[PDB]
Design a protein around this ligand. Structure first.
Ligand SMILES: CC1=C2C[C@H]3[C@@H](CC=C4C[C@@H](O)CC[C@@]43C)[C@@H]2CC[C@]12O[C@@H]1C[C@H](C)CN[C@H]1[C@H]2C
Length: 441
């Protein structure tokens, strides 16, 4: 009765749409066996590489767990933790005969509407292991960005309830609606393949959520470093040009250079006043300390304007004399706030890893968008192809459009590429000693 891609099944539960005794075949009808075994080889690579890289970092973080549980470094361990769990699920398919066990029902049809009766949970198990790891990962990614964010403006750890609960609820949720569909080319079960509304609601949207949140802490994070960094530079720049012109006023032999220098000094004196020093980054624009800063220049420029009041009249012997008195004013209201700023490489690399993680997560969001965007067509060209290839009666039947294997190879590059990058948090020149030190056993 049946005909490719429809396969014979006595099971009423597996019948396709309203066709008698015909369910949809397990192996994805939208891809050739060549595309399967190529895509499997892909995952086998990145799946295995990341799985090892992460476990190396897990195994290292526990080799100094005493001095590797303190924030913010402990985050990268839980970020790595989730990744190692995720890698497991993907690598599960390559076990001989598992890829068919995860995706196919009893009657040789691709798993759908899982969890279902009389069908082993080997599908929903894989879906849980992955979906939980994925979500627990990005939630811990928010923790990572938030920790880096506030390090300038902390032992408190009430994230655990949040990082472990939110993925759990989301997991139980998809199970409740029973929308764990299966796929052969990837070798994993996941939410809403047949019904992609669940995929958008449970994957695209939560990832889109952590993106805008995780970003805000990275955006408002670098702006805190951009402020501190640029402000010291702005103060340093002026202080130096100020001390140059100071050296020009003395060496000068006319009232023209002294006036010009005094103006170059005043032009820098003011531009330096319009900046929050790195020592007062945490204070308010209307705070007391910030007040003494800006007021310190109101006196300074006053001293300059006094000198200018002598340079213009032509009192060079007396204008240069005021420039000497500017040394003490300088040392008072400038040398104090100037300089003094250290960030530590601990936060530098967290910024690197904070941003590097953000990027590859944004890619994952992009993939699951397109996959969600064009699927409505992949349904049309399928339902038509089913009715076509069944109409064979005795080239014409050919699938119009399908999921781009490129988009997946891109996703699985970034999805794993993150875990590979997150694993290099412990690739510093200080970690080898940790392993040599514990090596004594
Ligand atoms: C087969 C199939 C699909 C294979 C597609 C999936 C969207 C995303 C990916 C990810 C990508 O890496 C590989 C390909 C994969 C798994 C798509 C969902 C719709 C459909 O499932 C329906 C079941 C239903 C019974 C009938 N109609 C069926 C088909 C329209």
């Amino acid at each position: 009765q049946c005909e490719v891609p429809l396969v014979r099944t006595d099971n009423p539960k597996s019948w396709y749409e309203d066709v008698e005794g015909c369910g949809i075949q397990c192996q994805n009808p939208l891809f050739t066996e060549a595309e399967h075994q190529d895509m499997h080889s892909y995952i086998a690579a990145f799946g295995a590489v990341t799985g090892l890289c992460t476990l190396f970092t897990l195994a290292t973080f526990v080799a100094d767990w005493r001095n590797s549980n303190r924030y913010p470094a402990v985050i990268l361990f839980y970020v790595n933790a989730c990744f190692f769990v995720g890698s497991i699920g993907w690598l599960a398919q390559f076990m001989d005969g598992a890829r068919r066990e995860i995706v196919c029902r009893a009657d040789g049809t691709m798993r759908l509407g899982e969890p279902t009766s009389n069908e082993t949970l080997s599908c929903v198990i894989i879906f849980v292991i992955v979906y939980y790891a994925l979500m627990a990962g990005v939630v811990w990614f928010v923790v990572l960005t938030y920790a880096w964010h506030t390090s300038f403006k902390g032992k408190t750890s009430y994230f655990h309830l949040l990082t472990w609960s939110l993925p759990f609820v989301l997991t139980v949720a998809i199970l409740a609606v029973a929308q764990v569909d299966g796929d052969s080319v990837s070798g994993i079960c996941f939410v809403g393949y047949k019904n992609y509304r669940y995929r958008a609601g449970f994957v695209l949207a939560p990832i889109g959520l952590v993106l805008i949140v995780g970003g805000y802490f990275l955006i408002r994070g670098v702006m805190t470093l951009f402020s501190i960094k640029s402000n010291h530079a702005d103060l340093e720049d002026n202080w130096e040009t100020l001390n140059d012109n100071l050296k020009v006023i003395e060496k000068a032999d006319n009232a023209a250079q002294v006036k010009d220098a005094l103006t170059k000094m005043r032009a820098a004196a003011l531009d330096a006043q319009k900046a929050t020093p790195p020592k007062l980054e945490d204070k308010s624009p209307d705070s007391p300390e910030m007040k003494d800063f800006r007021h310190g220049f109101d006196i300074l420029v006053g001293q300059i304007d006094d000198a200018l009041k002598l340079a213009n009249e032509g009192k060079v012997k007396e204008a240069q004399a005021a420039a000497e008195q500017l040394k003490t004013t300088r040392n008072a209201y400038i040398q104090k706030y100037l300089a003094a700023s250290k960030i530590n490489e601990t936060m530098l690399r967290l910024g690197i890893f904070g941003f590097l993680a953000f990027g590859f997560v944004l890619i994952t969001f992009s993939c699951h968008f397109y996959d969600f965007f064009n699927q409505a067509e992949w349904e049309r060209s399928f339902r038509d192809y089913v009715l076509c290839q069944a109409n064979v009666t005795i080239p014409d039947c050919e699938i119009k459009n399908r999921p781009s294997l490129l988009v997946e190879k891109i996703n699985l590059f970034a999805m794993f590429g993150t875990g590979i990058a997150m694993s290099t948090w412990v690739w510093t020149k200080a970690t080898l000693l940790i392993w040599r030190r514990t090596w004594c056993r």
